[PDB]
Amino acid sequence: PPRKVLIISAGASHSVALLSGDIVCSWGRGEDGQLGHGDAEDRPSPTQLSALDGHQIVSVTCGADHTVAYSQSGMEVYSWGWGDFGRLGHGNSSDLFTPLPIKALHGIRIKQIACGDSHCLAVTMEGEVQSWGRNQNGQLGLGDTEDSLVPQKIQAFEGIRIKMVAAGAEHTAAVTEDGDLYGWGWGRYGNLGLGDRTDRLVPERVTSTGGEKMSMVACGWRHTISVSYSGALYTYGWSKYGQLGHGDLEDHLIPHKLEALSNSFISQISGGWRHTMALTSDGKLYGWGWNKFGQVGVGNNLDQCSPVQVRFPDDQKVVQVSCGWRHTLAVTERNNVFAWGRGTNGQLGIGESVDRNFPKIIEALSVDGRYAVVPD
């Protein structure tokens, strides 16, 4: 029988999926080794990442040009791709093309791992956070800007249990299990919801919600998306292409409720380079923001400044979504994987290298069916 998709993720120009039986498949651009196949060759179609077979990989996430995965049964974390500046976690700046076990995080019961562009964070079962990578903008939350190659606990969260964290390019945003919202790092576009445009070196509580407790948080490049316990998105940050989806191109320095989606309960969110996706509890996928490559999946190439429902064939309900920098993936209630947006590196998994502006099925997964080189 077909092997259903348990998890999906998207990075700069690569995509990854975790399939039943804990089989990690990856495709797209792999020139930096982020695909984990031992070679830099691109993969236009989903290619089974054989290196992780039998490791009981429980989840997988993708950074800019690096990927991380973790198995709870083995209590191990593997990483590959662009791993310098310590984001690899091996205590050295190695960029190997195959998964390697992060020994600095061996034996830690990881509840979640969020991969930023050049840093990663790991929420353990105890509600703690451990961060590593480069700390140029204080995004690691260590109170000061020095790089760290080893997962370092964020002492700013002493005694606070964190439900989840999301990492952007140079900023992050943790959400406490009590419902608070924290933001730190590159905050020079209103990214952090702190009411100004200064980058913070420590997790700072976001007071501009009106008592609203936050359940989820997703960080794009220069914007952030937040969902409340019983509400809808509270987007903020840079809004030049409408990625905040408030009907205008005005940026917001504090969590600003997205009133257009106030009529439906939002179950999941995601943010890419300059676009945003919001999956409701009813299985409807709304997309907005930058649409140059069609990554909003609304059937055109015009930037969408307000939420638009992305239509799937036969009206399939969407159970999962994940936005890349310039592409998006979605897993539907029928275990069909659709991909849209930019596909010049075949990250859409369709087997082609052309751009699609609306959901296209990945048949290999869906049940239905170098550098400084002078050009010649």
Partner: protein, 304 residues
């Protein structure tokens, strides 16, 4: 004749640095490469302290070229492999401008010397674009029939540019009327990698055939040919002052030529399949910055 060797004055150990450039006062210098990071260093500290970048700007793409602004000391332009030309401020580490008209990798970016706000870029989409640092729309757009590897404003005027493309030629364009190139320079066997100007009239170019060539842009005839280095596949780097030329090699060494002598007047070995990635003369002074594929930055000085 005055110089016969290169003395090392400093060194910075890390990877590959593709562009290294001094600013208008030659006090600072910025480096960019695979790190996706523009690192601005103080030259005096580098040559005195036995180093740490005084500014670091992070990017979401690997960088290809880097150009300081001429009358705005703190402004530096960069081109990444996704075709985004960004003008940064090193004082505030902010992206002052972002131009995204290139559909592919942007190979070269250059600020005009006479009109500081003009910025010419050339990309793999076979497009040359001229932006003004007042609007986010390409002020001029030249479509060509080959990949553009280098674009360079004439030092004496912003109305003339030299475009070194993969068409094995250098197109000298008069931007006031872009119908056909004001000149076309041939004689290069492989793609043209680097374009520089010794003066208002002397153009130096480096191709991926181990060949540098002078050219009288006032005329259409060449002047000289320089051989003695190795350059077949890599952007080894080219730099020029009013009298000397210098280039990298796939043999991890920097060769220095006089504009009147074809044989290299000298060379220096960095001392593995490494190569020299970036080179840059400090003004007309004999000092020079050089960088190989290890990310090792060395400061060299012509001496007897």
């Amino acid at each position: 004749t005055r110089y016969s060797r290169l003395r090392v004055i400093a060194e910075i150990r890390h990877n590959i640095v593709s562009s290294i450039e001094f600013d208008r006062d030659d006090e600072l210098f910025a480096t960019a490469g695979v790190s996706r990071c523009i690192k601005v260093f103080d030259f005096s500290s580098v040559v005195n302290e036995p180093q740490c970048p005084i500014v670091e700007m992070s990017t979401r793409s690997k960088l290809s070229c880097l150009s300081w602004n001429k009358h705005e000391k703190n402004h530096i332009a960069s081109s990444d492999y996704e075709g985004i030309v960004t003008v940064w401020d090193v004082t505030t580490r902010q992206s002052l401008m972002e131009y995204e008209e290139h559909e592919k990798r942007a190979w070269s970016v250059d600020f005009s010397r006479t009109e500081p706000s003009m910025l010419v870029s050339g990309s793999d989409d076979c497009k040359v674009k001229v932006w003004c640092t007042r609007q986010e729309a390409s002020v001029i757009n030249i479509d060509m029939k080959a990949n553009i590897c280098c674009v360079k404003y004439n030092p004496g005027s912003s109305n003339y540019i030299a475009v070194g493309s993969a068409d094995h030629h250098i197109h000298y364009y008069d931007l006031r009327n872009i119908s056909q190139p004001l000149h076309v320079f041939s004689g290069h066997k492989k793609a043209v990698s680097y374009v520089k100007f010794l003066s208002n009239n002397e153009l130096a170019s480096a191709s991926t055939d181990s060949t540098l060539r002078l050219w009288d842009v006032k005329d259409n005839l060449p002047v000289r040919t320089f051989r003695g280095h190795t350059n077949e596949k890599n952007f080894v780097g080219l730099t020029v002052n009013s009298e000397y030329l210098a280039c990298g090699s796939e043999t991890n060494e920097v060769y220095v030529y006089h504009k009147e002598i074809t044989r290299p007047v000298t060379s220096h070995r960095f001392g593995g399949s490494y190569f020299i990635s970036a080179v840059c003369w400090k003004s007309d002074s004999p000092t020079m910055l050089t960088a190989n594929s290890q990310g090792t930055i060395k400061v060299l000085v012509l001496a007897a």
